[PDB]
Amino acid sequence: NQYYGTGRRKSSAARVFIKPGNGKIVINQRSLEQYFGRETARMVVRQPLELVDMVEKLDLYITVKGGGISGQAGAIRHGITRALMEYDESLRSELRKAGFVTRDARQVERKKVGLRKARRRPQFSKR
Amino acid sequence: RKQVSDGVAHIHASFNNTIVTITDRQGNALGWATAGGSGFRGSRKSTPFAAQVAAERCADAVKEYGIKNLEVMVKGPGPGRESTIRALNAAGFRITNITDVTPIPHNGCRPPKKRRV
Amino acid sequence: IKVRENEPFDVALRRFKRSCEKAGVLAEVRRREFYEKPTTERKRAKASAVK
Amino acid sequence: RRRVIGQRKILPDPKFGSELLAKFVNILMVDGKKSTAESIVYSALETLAQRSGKSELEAFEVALENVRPTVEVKSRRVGGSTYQVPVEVRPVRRNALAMRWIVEAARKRGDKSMALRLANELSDAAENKGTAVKKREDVHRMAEANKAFA
RNA sequence: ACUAUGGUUUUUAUU
């Protein structure tokens, strides 16, 4: 059976399929370490995968487009947990235990009016 | 060179110092120590620790004269007036009595009143 | 208590928690018509003062 | 059991032999440019083993055993008074502070920057010599001249 | 009762 999960984060969108079978991982029809190797988020997608042990009995197939690498990796991590919680509903209790089934507390908000980036405090020295 | 066996310990606690002196069965001071002589300054000479090590250094100031029993005389209100006893209870000799007296008692002697005036 | 009480004493009398300023006091014998309670034993919550 | 512990946060490295790593490479790090602060792993100690003696298996372990903070002295409230007290250096800080405290000679020694600075300050720290050690025993005695209540 | 620690509030004007 083909267990499906979508995931999205900061202008990036991903789709994940999980199947029982041979322990392989494919992304955008490339190997997991074929074009990544220096990017600071390239390992965070492995966090939920050791919870059921890696690359011995489960087939992964990932597709992604849009945004940048830290967005794509966070979208893929939650797409993996949304597919993995269909494969076995008792993993829900274990994915909560590590924070991997929740949308993280960083998302894009609309531009606060004027004032450059509108987050910094302006000049208030007393001179 | 000889054992005195019996004597008296003289303690004082002030708001700016702590003093411990030990006397033989004839009233002769064999050794003395103060918290100011222990390197401390101001009201820090009245800390419970400075009072404990001043007593420990006074037990070290009588280590050879051979003591088995004594009584204690406690003077003054200073905060060192409890911790000074713990190093003397570890000096290796018995404490037969402790006479406790503070100067100029009046008006209830400043205990905590616990939600009273 | 540290420096606020020296004496020879590190012991304390345990009559002063949930007995004073309340129940009671600002609302003395206010409701339910009780006449036992810790509010009658509040005359034991003394000394404290004078040592 | 769901919400329990929660575990990890950081993981132990099989090759570095120290858990201080996640706070050791946080030193001289600006605008999030980590690789310009991580530039001392398998480089500076490879040079220390070519500037003072031989090997590097215990040099960073023993330097922070020789330079070890244990007490700190602050003005602290009892209400309304604010007595000076000695307090013990908190267990998660106790060996993680001194490695960030060697700065009052860094712009003066002329050691030719980063990994070559580290290859000289550790050979003083491994004898409790040189920078900031006179100030460490000055705090140790700032807590000896007054021990407060314990 | 103990952050050791800062002098004292100008002659005096009169929308």
Swiss-Prot record, chain A:
Species, as recorded: Escherichia coli (strain K12)
Name of the coding gene: rpsI
Keyword annotations: Ribonucleoprotein, Ribosomal protein, RNA-binding, tRNA-binding
NCBIfam families in UniProt: PRK00132.1
Family per record: Belongs to the universal ribosomal protein uS9 family.
Cross-referenced InterPro entries: Ribosomal_Su5_D2-typ_SF (IPR020568), Ribosomal_uS9 (IPR000754), Ribosomal_uS9_bac/plastid (IPR023035), Ribosomal_uS9_CS (IPR020574), Ribsml_uS5_D2-typ_fold_subgr (IPR014721)
Gene3D superfamilies associated with the record: 3.30.230.10
Name of the protein: Small ribosomal subunit protein uS9
Any GO molecular function: structural constituent of ribosome
Domain of life: Bacteria
A Pfam cross-reference name: Ribosomal_S9
GO-annotated cellular components: cytoplasm; cytosol; cytosolic small ribosomal subunit
Record note on quaternary structure: Part of the 30S ribosomal subunit. Contacts 16S rRNA. Cross-links to the P site tRNA and weakly to the A site tRNA.
GO biological process entries: cytoplasmic translation
This protein's record includes keyword Transmembrane: no
Biological function: The C-terminal tail plays a role in the affinity of the 30S P site for different tRNAs. Mutations that decrease this affinity are suppressed in the 70S ribosome.
UniProtKB/Swiss-Prot annotation, chain B:
Any one of the GO CC terms: cytoplasm
InterPro entries: Ribosomal_uS11 (IPR001971), Ribosomal_uS11_bac-type (IPR019981), Ribosomal_uS11_CS (IPR018102), Ribosomal_uS11_sf (IPR036967)
Gene this protein is translated from: rpsK
Quaternary context: Part of the 30S ribosomal subunit. Interacts with proteins uS7 and bS18. Cross-links to IF-3. In stalled ribosomes contacts ribosome rescue factor SmrB.
Protein name: Small ribosomal subunit protein uS11
General remark: Has been predicted to contact the N-terminal domain of IF-3 based on footprint studies; exactly how IF-3 interacts with the 30S subunit is controversial.
Summary of the function given for this chain in its UniProt record: Located on the platform of the 30S subunit, it bridges several disparate RNA helices of the 16S rRNA. Forms part of the Shine-Dalgarno cleft in the 70S ribosome.
Keywords: Methylation, Ribonucleoprotein, Ribosomal protein, RNA-binding, rRNA-binding
Family to which this protein belongs: Belongs to the universal ribosomal protein uS11 family.
Native species: Escherichia coli (strain K12)
GO BP terms in the entry: cytoplasmic translation; translation
Gene3D superfamilies tied to this protein: Ribosomal protein S11
Molecular function as annotated in GO: small ribosomal subunit rRNA binding; structural constituent of ribosome
From Swiss-Prot, chain C:
Organism lineage string: Bacteria, Pseudomonadati, Pseudomonadota, Gammaproteobacteria, Enterobacterales
Keywords: Ribonucleoprotein, Ribosomal protein, RNA-binding, rRNA-binding
GO biological process, one term: ribosomal small subunit assembly
Protein name: Small ribosomal subunit protein bS21
Native organism: Escherichia coli (strain K12)
Role of this protein: Probbly involved in recognition of ribosome rescue factor SmrB in stalled/collided disomes; fusion of protein fragments to its N-terminus decreases ribosome rescue in the presence of SmrB.
Part of the whole protein covered: 4 to 54 of 71
Skewed-composition ranges (Basic residues): 43-51
Domain of life where this protein originates: Bacteria
GO MF: rRNA binding; structural constituent of ribosome
UniProt similarity note: Belongs to the bacterial ribosomal protein bS21 family.
One of the record's GO cellular component terms: cytosolic small ribosomal subunit
Assembly and oligomerization: Part of the 30S ribosomal subunit. In stalled ribosomes contacts ribosome rescue factor SmrB.
Swiss-Prot record, chain D:
Keyword Cytoplasm: no
Mutagenesis or variant effect for residue 114 to G: Significantly decreases affinity for its own mRNA
Disulfide bonds: none
GO molecular function, one term: tRNA binding
Entry keywords, A to Z: Ribonucleoprotein, Ribosomal protein, RNA-binding, rRNA-binding, tRNA-binding
Any Gene Ontology CC annotation: membrane
Biological processes per GO annotation: cytoplasmic translation; negative regulation of translation; ribosomal small subunit assembly; translation
Keyword RNA-binding (UniProt): yes
Note: The strain K12 sequence is shown. Has been predicted to contact the N-terminal domain of IF-3 based on footprint studies; exactly how IF-3 interacts with the 30S subunit is controversial.
Family according to the record: Belongs to the universal ribosomal protein uS7 family.
Subunit structure: Part of the 30S ribosomal subunit. Contacts proteins S9 and S11. Cross-links to IF3 and the P and E site tRNAs.
Function: One of the primary rRNA binding proteins, it binds directly to 16S rRNA where it nucleates assembly of the head domain of the 30S subunit. Is located at the subunit interface close to the decoding center, where it has been shown to contact mRNA. Has been shown to contact tRNA in both the P and E sites; it probably blocks exit of the E site tRNA. Protein S7 is also a translational repressor protein; it regulates the expression of the str operon members to different degrees by binding to its mRNA.
Protein name: Small ribosomal subunit protein uS7
Encoding gene (name): rpsG
Residues of the full protein shown: 3 to 152 of 179
